[PDB]
Structures are given as C-alpha cells and as structure tokens.
Design a protein around this ligand. Sequence first.
Ligand SMILES: [Fe+3]
Length: 329
Amino acid sequence: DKTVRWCAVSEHEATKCQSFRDHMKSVIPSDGPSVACVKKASYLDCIRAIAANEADAVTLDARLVYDAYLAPNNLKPVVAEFYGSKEDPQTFYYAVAVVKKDSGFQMNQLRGKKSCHTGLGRSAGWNIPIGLLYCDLPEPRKPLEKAVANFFSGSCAPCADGTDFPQLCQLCPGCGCSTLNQYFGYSGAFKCLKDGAGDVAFVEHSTIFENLANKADRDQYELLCLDNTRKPVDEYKDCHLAQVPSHTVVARSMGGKEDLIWELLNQAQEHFGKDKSKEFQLFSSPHGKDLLFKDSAHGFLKVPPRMDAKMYLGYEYVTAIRNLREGTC
Ligand SMILES: [Fe+3]
C-alpha cells in the first residue's frame, strides 16, 4: 500500500511523526501503509507541498480546509477527526471564549482588551469570534487584521504579518505559525490567558479540560456567552460562540492517495487510537499538544467519495464565510 508523506509543521510534530512512523512499522504488515515525514514551517507550506506533489497529507482546521480548496491548491478533505466519544462520535466541536473569573467584561465589552487567538484564519481562534465582533470593530473594517488590531489593546494572532499589523503580535512577537511560538494553537492561546498576557482566549470547548486537570483551577475561569452573560467552563453546550466542523486531513484531488491515507489512519487508530496503547498515542504527546491531530479527538471517519470542501463543511458554515467576506452592518 506504499507510503503516505505526512506534512509535519515544525520540530515537535516532526518528532511525533517519526515515533508514529516507527510504531506503525512495528505492528503493520510489510505490505501495509507506512508513514514518511516531511517537515515544514507552517500549515500553508504544507498545503503548497501537497499541491506540489511534495507531500500527501496534513490535518487542518475547518476554515483552513476551505482555503486549501481554493486555487491554485484545490485540495480536498479525505478524513475527519471526530470528538466526544466512541458511542456518540461528533464531527464538530464548539468555539468558545475563555476568560478569567472576576475580570469584569462581557462579549459586548471586549474593546480595549488583550486577546489570544489560536491562529489567523482558524475557526475558533479567529473567523468565528471576529465574525461576531465584526461590526463592533472601528472602520475601516477591511483589512480585517488592521481592524482587529485597533479593536483590542494588543494580542497574539499566530501566522499574521507583524510588519503590517504589529498589535497582532504584541503578545507573541513575530506571530510564529507553529508550536515554536508558545502561544500558538488551542493550548498556546490558553497559556497566553493562564499566564496573564491576555484577557481572553478564543479556543475550543475542550481546551481548558485538555490543559487544566484540577477542577479547582478551572473554577477560576469562565466563558463569555452570546447574550453578554458568563457561565462556567463546563456549560459550553449552551454558552459558546458557534459549533464548527472537525479538523480534517486534506489531500490532492487527483493522485492524492485518499485510499491509502484512510487505510493508514484507520489502522493507526485501531492500534494507537484513544486509550488503545500505552506505547504510543495518536492523540497526545510528551512533546506538545495537538501535534498532527487534535488531542481532543477520539478517532477518524472517512469523508464521502469525491466530496469537496464546500460540500463537506455544510451550508451554514459556508454561508458564514460569504457573510464575513461580504461584510455588512
Ligand atoms: Fe480548530
């Protein structure tokens, strides 16, 4: 079944990718799928490499999955992570806004606060919250990056251009687009909040549970609800900004090895999936969180035949894309 060239973003994912490679070769038959690792500096380098036939797969946030579908890359979603549990696999998660208890501000009072984002262009960390805050932003609202920079009093938006928008990297100079940046991703945006650099962290409902084991510590955090009220972090079901599609593995439309990618990940989850093995874990790592796949993931599900990004994401989500692209207030 040959090799799947997985695109790892930076050293931490590269390390996990190597371990993945070795453990698979230890339990998979000689004629079964194998994993090779291609190291890049950002998810964007991964998209291009795949489009260039230099790599075959990379897992992306749903909003980035849409971007990957755009010319000249034209990539397609092939395997989706799922969450929740084995009994009720959910191919979605919730975008939430975590804040410190007693900080004294609601969703409608975010102007002038310091913000922590998982990364520019990602569902929970950017597009969802910024979409809801769009009209509260000072004009001109486009380019978005500049408007967001002016709205907050400094933030960290990984992957954004610090030269054009320095305010977006005040909390994480350079705005690194990988785990090399301590405030990158879900875990990074949360740390940015926990360590006191920012007042709010736009992440997923699972983020605080994935990063803080003690309930006593979690009781010092809250969530900002749409009706301008706050609720405990465990009440995300009825206090979130939006429900968003799973992070998903993308590949080329033609000659993309979608068949081998599924086989690799399906066999991988049977051997090293959630709580499957003590020797290696697909959804965790001593080198960092959310490497290659989200830690909050419980497994994988195959995307229907030839489905493109638009079909996969669903009507609601694509509408919100058009809505943001065509601002209006
Ligand atoms: Fe995400």
